[PDB]
DNA sequence: GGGTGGGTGGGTGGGT
């Protein structure tokens, strides 16, 4: 990673003309960090690799070198909706863009290879499919006249991370996109990432066929935020009327996010505040490009209050002043929350990260992330960041990035930083062997427990044929009992069984590998509490 | 409801 801060400065050539786009065109008042840099190295002619989080504005630094020269812009990017969000983006601007996939008609097909080869054409930006690039001979002979013309000179890579067969959503098309600057090298290629391990960069950058080419990788930690983790209600009403009484009492007329575990939540806690009075509006990547349109017309001219998007792909929020964030169910991972919190404060005002952890919230994600060969390590570290209530927030989080040291002070900006309180080591070895008991009673009895038929044995109720009597109700409220039961999966001394049924996945509960341990009457298991 | 209607329709429609 050569230093970035050499290309801060607007000494170049084209500094002017780079201005100008940046305030004329884009309307956009000052640089968020590292966009001049990269902007300026792009310009350059070399070759650059951004890894900014999701939100950052790493678009603007290869839209905005498009019209910096003569020509147009080749992006390659992996979906059509987000072609189709940036190409929204560009017709709201002005700017001459388009797009080509699969499903494209063959009229404009034929109106994109005219356009490319074009000497007047008012094209800026093509946004293509790496298919286009891999099957289809023809548009690569349109893109090779287009390079002889000197009708493009710039390369994007959106998600260049995917290039790599280590990276994320890795494609097979994508393995040939090194035919890019083999046959084209005076175009200068710029590839985005949001999610980028630094071995994954490098092997993107080998298949790209790339030998020297510059890493801007932005800050992690964001001064402006404060972490929080609250405890989700059994019920999903008083959720909605908590939410509602938090939207009301310190947030009264300023815009939020609220991320759902499911699109059909996301709906019903949309139809909840709207019921209730706040100005709520549903969006998610399946909606259609009017509801989209309408939603988002909505959300900039602050007629809609919160925005409930689901966490599976609703990325099309670009707010500068989101005040808060509040995740009704967990998120799948901690990359994942960080990316989904990190949509706040983009004004760099303070802003509030808010997650209410739920139980069953836990065995939800479990069941949908059980192909994933990794997935419930991930979803167990954000457990365990939701179950701490003394460690700060930032240093949880930084612990899960291995490719980034974070020392930057919290400030009293979470949860735990703040609520001055001493703590003790609750021991739960009782309860753990209780638990152990239920479940040896079961595995006799030859039947299946789920964690609610599993906690109403251990506070006694449910059906009487699974108890144990030598087990005492452990007298204390049910989210505790939540708690603890959590406390037992983490360790491991409990396990999940997952079971494939013709609806859905379901997660059982099982004797976890720890539970021999337990044969030693020494043998201790604590958990923090606060006094 | 019926499961020879199908699992991307969605479990929160209901009941198999
Ligand atoms: N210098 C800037 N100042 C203010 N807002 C910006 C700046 N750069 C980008 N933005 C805004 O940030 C939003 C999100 O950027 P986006 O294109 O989503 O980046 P990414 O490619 O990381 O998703 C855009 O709507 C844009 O208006
Ligand atoms: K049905
Ligand atoms: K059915
Ligand atoms: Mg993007
Ligand atoms: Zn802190």
């Known amino acids: 990673d050569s230093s970035p801060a050499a290309w801060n400065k607007e000494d170049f050539p084209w500094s002017g003309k780079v201005k100008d786009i940046l305030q004329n065109v884009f309307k956009l008042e000052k640089f968020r960090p590292l966009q001049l840099e990269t902007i300026n190295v792009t310009m350059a002619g070399k070759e650059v690799f951004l890894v900014m989080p999701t939100g950052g504005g790493k678009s603007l630094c290869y839209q905005l070198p498009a ?17 189709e ?30 356009e490319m080869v074009n000497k007047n054409s008012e094209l800026k930006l093509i946004y293509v499919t790496p298919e286009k690039i891999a099957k289809s001979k023809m548009f690569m002979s349109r893109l090779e006249k287009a390079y002889e013309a000197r009708r493009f000179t710039r390369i994007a890579v959106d998600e260049v991370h995917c290039c790599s067969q280590w990276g994320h959503d890795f494609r097979p098309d994508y393995k040939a996109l090194g035919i890019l600057k083999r046959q084209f090298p ?12 630094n071995h994954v960069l490098t092997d993107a950058q080998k298949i790209l066929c790339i030998e020297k080419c510059f890493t ?17 209600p059994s019920n999903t009403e008083d959720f909605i009327e908590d939410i509602v009484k938090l939207i009301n009492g310190r947030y009264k ?11 059909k939540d996301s709906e019903q806690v949309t139809v909840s505040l709207q019921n209730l009075g706040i100005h709520a509006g549903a969006y998610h990547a399946n909606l259609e490009p009017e509801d989209k349109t309408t939603v988002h017309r909505k959300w900039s001219a602050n007629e809609i209050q919160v925005v409930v998007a689901t966490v599976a792909f609703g990325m099309g929020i670009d707010k500068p002043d989101v005040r808060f964030v509040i995740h009704h169910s967990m998120s799948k991972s901690m990359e994942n929350y960080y990316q989904e919190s990190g949509r706040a404060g983009r004004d760099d005002m303070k802003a509030d990260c808010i997650l209410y952890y739920g139980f069953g919230d836990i065995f939800r994600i479990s069941s949908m992330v059980v192909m994933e ?40 900006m979470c949860d735990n930083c703040c609520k001055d309180s001493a703590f003790e080591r609750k021991n739960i070895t009782e309860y753990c062997r209780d638990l152990i008991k239920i ?16 906690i109403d044995s251990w506070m006694g109720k449910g059906a009487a044929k699974l108890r144990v009597a030598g087990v005492v109700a452990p007298t204390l409220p049910r989210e505790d009992l939540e708690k603890i039961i959590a406390h037992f999966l983490i360790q491991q001394y409990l396990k999940e069984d997952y079971s494939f049924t013709a609806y859905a996945t379901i997660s059982y509960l099982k ?6 341990l337990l044969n030693n009457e020494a043998h201790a298991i604590t958990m923090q509490v606060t006094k």
């Open 186 to 197: 005076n175009a200068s290629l710029i590839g985005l990432t949001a999610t980028a391990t």
């Open 85 to 114: 969000d940036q190409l929204m983006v560009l017709k709201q601007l002005g700017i001459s863009a388009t797009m080509l996939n699969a499903s494209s008609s063959k009229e404009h097909v034929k109106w994109v290879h005219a």
């Open 216 to 232: 801007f990788t932005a800050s992690f930690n964001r001064p402006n935020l404060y972490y929080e983790v609250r405890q989700k």
């Open 511 to 516: 004797i976890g590998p720890k539970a021999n």
């Open 67 to 83: 019209l910096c020269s003569d020509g147009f812009t080749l992006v390659i990017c992996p979906l059509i909706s987000l072609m």
């Open 253 to 263: 007329g300023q815009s939020g996010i609220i991320y759902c575990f499911s699109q």
């Open 373 to 412: 060969n990794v997935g419930q390590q991930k979803l167990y570290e954000m457990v365990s960041y939701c179950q701490n209530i003394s460690k700060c927030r930032r240093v949880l989080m930084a612990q899960h990035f291995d490719e980034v040291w974070n020392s930057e002070a919290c400030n009293k």
């Open 439 to 454: 479940l040896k009673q079961a595995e006799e009895l030859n039947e299946k427990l789920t964690p609610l038929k599993l």
